Design a protein around this ligand. Structure first.
Ligand SMILES: C[As](C)(=O)[O-]
Ligand SMILES: C[As](C)(=O)[O-]
Ligand SMILES: [Mg+2]
Ligand SMILES: [Mg+2]
Ligand SMILES: [Zn+2]
Ligand SMILES: [Zn+2]
Ligand SMILES: [Zn+2]
Ligand SMILES: [Zn+2]
Ligand SMILES: [Zn+2]
Ligand SMILES: [Zn+2]
Lengths: 166, 166
């Protein structure tokens, strides 16, 4: 029932901050992390590594502009040009308020902005800015928890350090 | 999957403000309204008008202290004394900050407070104060929408006026 959140972010230090903000916020849609724009487009179009996934758009895309191989703006344009994808809400993760302002000038109907580094308060404020629907839960869905934990571990192994213990 | 929110509130003018804040916030758990503490306890215990309802606790109780017949504090004590009910998060709707402070002194583990009149911003801040889990949705669940619309209509017919049109 709950659709995933697609987090598109290469820089592993930034990924850490964004996932921690997500964990802290208790936002419970399953996170799916891809690390460049080619992988994001594969996820969204169900190709590549994602060829076998269930049909359906993510609830939200958290889209870093800084992506190797295929830039974040190319992902955003292909999303908004697609009749299938164009309805997906997007939070752009930018480097400065000036960058957010420039992106607004492209008129790609970006729904919200977070200026990096991502912190919990600004992050939740961006999600609130989307003006989409939401619901409270007593229990997180177990697949969501498993996914966050799995990424925390992969990211820890890759960065060769951890910040907390569960 | 999503559990309802139980709104316990007699005064019809206050009910209007609380439902509008809920509608505006796009919080999408189904609302269930009861108008005094006797009805609230019947809902929670599946008795009375609610004898046939599905098993399960509401996600949140929005509990007005001012209730005819059975007071809101008696509902809160019976909830916290019950091994079945005591885990339910409660937002108390109070008349002043002094009232919130007094209620905190009872040590009934009240999770959040809204000082009436309820407005959208303070309302969402109270829900955030609960520190519970939540999820975003593109579509509200249709049963939720039907329920809000149904109450708006009953409340309009009872107050003999409306404030907006859908
Ligand atoms: C040494 As330890 C608390 O990271 O298992
Ligand atoms: C007169 As009318 C806009 O309440 O149907
Ligand atoms: Mg980047
Ligand atoms: Mg009252
Ligand atoms: Zn350690
Ligand atoms: Zn680190
Ligand atoms: Zn963690
Ligand atoms: Zn009218
Ligand atoms: Zn009115
Ligand atoms: Zn309405």
């Amino acid at each position: 029932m709950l659709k995933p959140i697609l987090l598109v972010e290469d820089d592993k230090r930034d990924l850490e901050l964004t996932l921690v903000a997500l964990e802290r916020s208790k936002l419970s849609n399953e996170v799916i992390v891809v690390r460049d724009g080619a992988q994001a487009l594969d996820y969204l179009n169900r190709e590549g590594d994602f060829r076998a996934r269930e049909e359906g758009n993510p609830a939200v895309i958290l889209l870093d502009l800084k992506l190797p191989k295929v830039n974040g703006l190319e992902v955003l344009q292909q999303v908004r040009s697609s009749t299938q994808l164009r309805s997906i809400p997007v939070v752009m993760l930018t480097s400065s308020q000036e960058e957010s302002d420039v992106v607004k000038s492209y008129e790609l109907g970006v729904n919200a902005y977070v200026v990096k580094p991502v912190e919990f308060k600004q992050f939740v404020a961006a999600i609130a800015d989307l003006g989409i629907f939401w619901a409270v839960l007593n229990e997180p869905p177990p697949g969501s928890m498993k996914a966050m934990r799995r990424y925390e571990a992969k990211l820890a192994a890759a960065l060769e350090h951890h910040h907390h213990h569960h």
